[PDB]
Structures are given as C-alpha cells and as structure tokens.
Design a protein around this ligand. Sequence first.
Ligand SMILES: O=c1[nH]cnc2c1ncn2CC(COCP(=O)(O)O)COCP(=O)(O)O
Ligand SMILES: O=c1[nH]cnc2c1ncn2CC(COCP(=O)(O)O)COCP(=O)(O)O
Ligand SMILES: O=c1[nH]cnc2c1ncn2CC(COCP(=O)(O)O)COCP(=O)(O)O
Ligand SMILES: O=c1[nH]cnc2c1ncn2CC(COCP(=O)(O)O)COCP(=O)(O)O
Ligand SMILES: [Mg+2]
Ligand SMILES: [Mg+2]
Ligand SMILES: [Mg+2]
Ligand SMILES: [Mg+2]
Ligand SMILES: [Mg+2]
Ligand SMILES: [Mg+2]
Lengths: 176, 173, 176, 173
Amino acid sequence: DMKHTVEVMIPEAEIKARIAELGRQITERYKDSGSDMVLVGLLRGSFMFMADLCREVQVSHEVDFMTASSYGSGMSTTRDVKILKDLDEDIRGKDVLIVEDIIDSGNTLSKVREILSLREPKSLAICTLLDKPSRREVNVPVEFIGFSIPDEFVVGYGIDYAQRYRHLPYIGKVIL
Amino acid sequence: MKHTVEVMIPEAEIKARIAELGRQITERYKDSGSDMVLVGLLRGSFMFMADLCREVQVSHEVDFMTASSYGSTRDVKILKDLDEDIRGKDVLIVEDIIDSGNTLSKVREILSLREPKSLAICTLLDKPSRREVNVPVEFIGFSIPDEFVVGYGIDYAQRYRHLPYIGKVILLD
Amino acid sequence: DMKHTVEVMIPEAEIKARIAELGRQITERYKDSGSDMVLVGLLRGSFMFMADLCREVQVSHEVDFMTASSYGSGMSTTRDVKILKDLDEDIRGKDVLIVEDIIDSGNTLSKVREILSLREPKSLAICTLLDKPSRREVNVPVEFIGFSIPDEFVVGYGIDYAQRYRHLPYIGKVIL
Amino acid sequence: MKHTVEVMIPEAEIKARIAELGRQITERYKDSGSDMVLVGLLRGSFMFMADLCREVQVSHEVDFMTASSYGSTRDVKILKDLDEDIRGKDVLIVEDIIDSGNTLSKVREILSLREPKSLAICTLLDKPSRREVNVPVEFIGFSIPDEFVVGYGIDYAQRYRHLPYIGKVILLD
Ligand SMILES: O=c1[nH]cnc2c1ncn2CC(COCP(=O)(O)O)COCP(=O)(O)O
Ligand SMILES: O=c1[nH]cnc2c1ncn2CC(COCP(=O)(O)O)COCP(=O)(O)O
Ligand SMILES: O=c1[nH]cnc2c1ncn2CC(COCP(=O)(O)O)COCP(=O)(O)O
Ligand SMILES: O=c1[nH]cnc2c1ncn2CC(COCP(=O)(O)O)COCP(=O)(O)O
Ligand SMILES: [Mg+2]
Ligand SMILES: [Mg+2]
Ligand SMILES: [Mg+2]
Ligand SMILES: [Mg+2]
Ligand SMILES: [Mg+2]
Ligand SMILES: [Mg+2]
C-alpha cells in the first residue's frame, strides 16, 4: 500500500487487435484436430482474457477454470503449488489450451502444466496475454504470447495490484 | 439430440444493454464510499462479468464462487468460496441466467451471513416463468420467455459458452 | 516458535472414559429420531475426536467433514468465515451433530452453524471435546461438552501447536 | 438391496495390527531427520489415520486430501488439497483400501511433483486381485480376497463408517 499512479502500457484497442490475431493462430492450429478442445483459465487473473479470447477462437470448445495456490511473490518461491479449485471437467484425450494473464517467474504455471499433463490430454499448450521474460525463473514451454513486455509491474485486464484495477480495459503500469 | 443454433440476442444488443447496466450500477454505488466487489458465479458468468466490470466506472474488486450444480432438491454447497472478505462492502452478485432462482437464493443467504454493507444481484437473463423461490434482483439485462438459450457463457452439455451472442437451440425432427 | 514443554492435562484414559459417556448421551438423544443422522467434523482438528466418538455412538449414522477458513487467532477476529471444503453429502431433513475439538472464542464454529442451518436439517447440535469458556467471545449453543478447561493453550488429540502434536493420545498444555 | 453385516476382522485384531504397523513405520522414519507428515485420503481413511498416528512414535504432522470419487475412466481431480507443504518432507499416504489402485496411483503422482524427500503408502486393507495399475505399497495391514467389506471408515452407500471392526455385507435372497 504505497502512493502511485497508473500509466497506460497497452491501450484497449491494441489488446483487442492482438487477441484477434491470437484467435486466428489458435484457430488455425486446432481446426483439424477432430478431438474435443477446452480452454483452461487460471483464476482469477485470466477471466477477462479468457472471455475475449474464446470469442475469437473459431473452434468448438469448452471453457473451464482452475484456481492454483497464490501466496505472495516471495512465498510462491518456497511453497508447494496446490489446487484450490480443480477443473469441473475431464481433459483426457482433449486438446487443452491453458489461458494465462501474465507469465512473470512462471513457477506456478509450470507446476500447473505438470499436474494437467498427468491426466493425459491429447495435447497441452499455453497461451498467455503477457510475458515478462526478464523475470523468468523457470523454463516453461509457451506456445502463444500476446505481448513480451518490459520489467514493469502491470495492472488491468484481470491483473491486479493488491486486488485493485482488475476491471481496467487496458494494461497499465504502476508508477511509484 | 440433433440441433442447431440461431441468434436470439445479437452481440451488438448485448453490448449496448451492458453499457446501460454499467451506467445504472455506477450510479447506485458511486457515492457509497465503502469498498465494492463484483461476485461472479462460475462457470456461467465469466464472460458477462468480463464485459460488465469494464463498464462499471467505480473502483471495485472482482471475485468468484462455484456453487454445487446438479441440473434441473439437493443442498446448495460451496465448491469454491470467495478469495476475499466482503464484510462491510457493497456486493453485487453477477449472474448469467436467473431461472428457478434456487441456487442464487441460497448463495445470497450464505453471503448475507458475512454482513456486507449491501447485497444485490445483476443477471444478464431473467426467466420469470420458471421462478420457484422469490429472490430480489436489482439489475436485469433481458427478460425472456421460457426458451432454451445458449452462448455468452451459457452452455448446452458444456457446448457454446464461447458464442458472442445469446442463441436459441433448435431441436431437429 | 518458542522454547516450551508439554504437560499432561487430560490423560488418555480420562478422554476415553469421557467419550464413552458422551457416546451414551448422544445415543440416548437420537435413538428414536427415525430420521437419518450425520456427524459433521471440522477439519483438521476434530479427526481424532470424530473417529473415537462415532465408534461410541450406537446409532446408524453417516460421517462427513468440513474445512472452514482458519487464519491466525488475530485475523480470525476480522476475516469472513469461508468454506474451503464443503460437505460431501446433503443434510436437509437429517439430524446433524457438529463435532468440534475445542471451542475457544467460538467465532468460526458460530458461523459454520449458521451456514449449515440454511440447509434446513431436521436438527442441528454441537458436540465439542473441549470448551474454554473463559475465552468465549460469541454466544453459541453447545449441546455436548467433554471437558470445560482452564485458560491454557492445549495440544494433542488432533489439536496442534503450529502443526505440531496432533498425534498425541492425550490432551497436553504448552508451558513456555 | 436387503443385507446384514458379519464381523470379518475383529476390533481387537485391527488394534493389534495397527500397533505393529506403527512400530514398522516408526522404525523406517526414526533416523530421517526431516519433517514427517501423514496424509489421509478422505473420507475413508479418517478412522485409520486417528489410530495409526497415535502409534507412530515419531514427531509428525497430519494432513488430508479429498480426491474425486466416481465409484467403480474419469480424471482424478483434487476436491481438497493439502493444507501444508510437503517439499523435502517424509510423506506417508494413509489409505483404507487399495483395490484397483487408480485414484491412489494418480494422487501419488500429484504429490510426487512437489518433491518430498520420500513418498510411501500405508493401507489398512489390500485387495491384490482387483489391481489395475501397479502402485508401490510399503505398509499393508491386511491382504483380503475380493470381498465387499465395510466398517472402520469404509462405507456402503454412506453407511457403516462408524463400525469399530471390518465387516462383510451379506446380501439376502
Ligand atoms: O506485473 C505484475 N502485476 C501483478 N502481479 C504480478 C506481476 N508480476 C508478478 N505478479 C504476481 C503473479 C500474479 O499473482 C497475483 P496474486 O496471486 O494476487 O498475488 C504472477 O503470476 C504468477 P508467475 O510469476 O509464476 O508467472
Ligand atoms: O436456457 C438455459 N440454457 C442452459 N442452462 C439453463 C437454461 N435455463 C436454465 N438452465 C440451467 C441453469 C444453469 O445451470 C448452472 P450450472 O449447472 O452450474 O452450469 C439455470 O439456473 C437456474 P437458477 O439460477 O434460477 O437457480
Ligand atoms: O488451546 C488452543 N490450542 C490450539 N489452538 C487453539 C487453542 N485456542 C484457540 N486455538 C485456535 C483455534 C483452532 O485453530 C487452530 P489453526 O487454524 O491451525 O490456527 C480454536 O478454534 C477456533 P475458535 O477459537 O473459534 O473456537
Ligand atoms: O469392499 C469395499 N467397500 C466399500 N468400497 C469399496 C470396496 N472395494 C472397493 N471399494 C471402492 C473404493 C472406495 O471408494 C473411495 P470413495 O468413493 O471416495 O468413498 C476403493 O477404491 C479403489 P482404489 O483405492 O484401488 O483406487
Ligand atoms: Mg494470475
Ligand atoms: Mg497480487
Ligand atoms: Mg448461473
Ligand atoms: Mg479446529
Ligand atoms: Mg494453529
Ligand atoms: Mg480410500
């Protein structure tokens, strides 16, 4: 809780345009699979990205969600990744696309991929809106990236700052 | 069951209606002063929540619950509770369809125990005909007859959640 | 995490004897109900008490469990009581006995009773192994009490001290 | 289905067998030095856990999980995860019956990802005949034939969990 301002990093229109492209790419990849497809969102951060993204995915798919253990940025480095809420549906034999808002360290996401892989989906890929590779701690396969971004603390579009700013239609950055 | 899907409420009409809802919601809670939170019932309300919260011009938090779903006489149970506290906060439950009102009626009671400052419901679709339990609903996007609709988060055997419009399922025979 | 010792407060044999009595009383109360009965344990603390107690309850019943939000002793006074894991079964129209290890302030237990009451069981009662009334903050109906105890920090028999001592077969007290 | 319940494994034999199990478990982990935790799969293992941990003469934590149960080809899902971390700890999964081994096999894989120091399984009952997936089981209370048993945490349509013995259900006709 410290005095700050929020500057725009990615305007609403740019996000919309990029997600349209992501949609085309994801559609092109999975259109001929013939197996069931499901987009899996990591709550809470990816709810907005999921809503906009799945509307641009022109393939019959299911939408499902998952809540993994959060903790701080410092305790997440030393604590187990736990399932606070598992999927509602099966993914065995299905094309699964994990929908993430932002990959910073990539710790939690890495563990989540491992967990879902045990369920033997036909395929398992990740789509993140934002990637901050300067902050990457764990090597993790990421098939779709909306934006590779600077080393900034970002907010908006589902992403929060102490539970604040999730409803912003753009990606902003916190300036102390 | 062989079927098809026709547009009932176009994407453009949904967007317009939500913008209006956002203005109404903004107006009711603008001078509250207390923390505000929009609470979505998963999975159905995720898309409605995304668009709606972007039209609410009040600083608020977004949270989610998952209540037990059995289909069309069992206990309403919490599969996933809120992540944050709501005591002393303005709380708006965000729902996709109100039909029988059973689950939502119980979810409201459960949240009411936590003593929020206020507690209200916003639903995209309302089917007044199928109501079994009378539950107050302050904000309503559309009132429809007893039609089986899909899209915009609403599914049919897990299908069609990703449609940008509300559509009607036409059974073929 | 501070240097301490554990002294016995209620020896294993005394717990066994008292639970036998509790069993007789609970049996006498519910033997003629004719409706289904379920004992509901609040995890993790009441797992041992539940195992021993239900074996002394000579009435056909179901065993179910529930995990409510924990937090510290200081944050539990200002945070909502949340359901981390709800019951597996319905309780509507059933005789429900909530099985608790210890009632200190009684905050969390109070809220849990409220939540279960919404499901309209035929009856709803509470059985706690230990009651510490000197520390009671909220007035809550408690139908069965194993022991009313001094203002001591107790451990053992499911009850922990920073996750420690749950497996002790007796009730002990922490001495700094 | 009309039935009755006869004693198969008396309360006294269960107690004796568990005391022995406690000694074996105590011996294997006494000189480990790392934190130890017993992990029970709910609901079946709550009674077995209670008695077993009281016979384990090693300082340990007790925790629980609830995995998806569907009955006698779906994903194993976590309805309730551990409350505590297990990385670098000696972990003993405490189970009531091993039968097909399906759920337990998946639960072990999930916990294995968290990199505990060691990972083992203790089950009260083993039915080797019904095994579909080979999963290592270090400690076993009793090996039984393919019998439908109840009691000691094990249920039949939610019934008989509170029986202090293992019993067999006799169908009547
Ligand atoms: O710029 C950022 N903006 C808001 N959050 C960030 C940012 N960077 C890292 N975080 C924190 C987390 C998001 O979790 C938010 P929380 O659970 O509410 O504390 C990054 O996602 C997990 P990972 O680092 O493994 O990819
Ligand atoms: O047209 C419809 N299309 C798809 N479903 C419908 C429709 N109509 C009623 N449903 C079923 C349900 C949605 O079920 C919630 P879920 O099982 O968690 O996905 C409406 O809830 C009744 P209410 O909110 O009044 O208690
Ligand atoms: O003597 C005591 N011994 C161990 N614990 C105690 C005692 N006293 C109060 N506690 C803490 C809590 C138990 O929670 C343990 P936690 O979630 O792991 O921190 C008392 O139960 C809740 P309430 O106070 O509302 O009846
Ligand atoms: O004699 C039996 N009596 C009551 N049940 C039995 C028996 N035999 C196999 N079951 C069913 C199950 C118990 O189901 C766990 P739940 O649904 O969460 O309560 C044994 O699990 C098979 P495995 O552990 O090898 O994966
Ligand atoms: Mg996130
Ligand atoms: Mg955060
Ligand atoms: Mg709904
Ligand atoms: Mg407790
Ligand atoms: Mg504690
Ligand atoms: Mg089991």
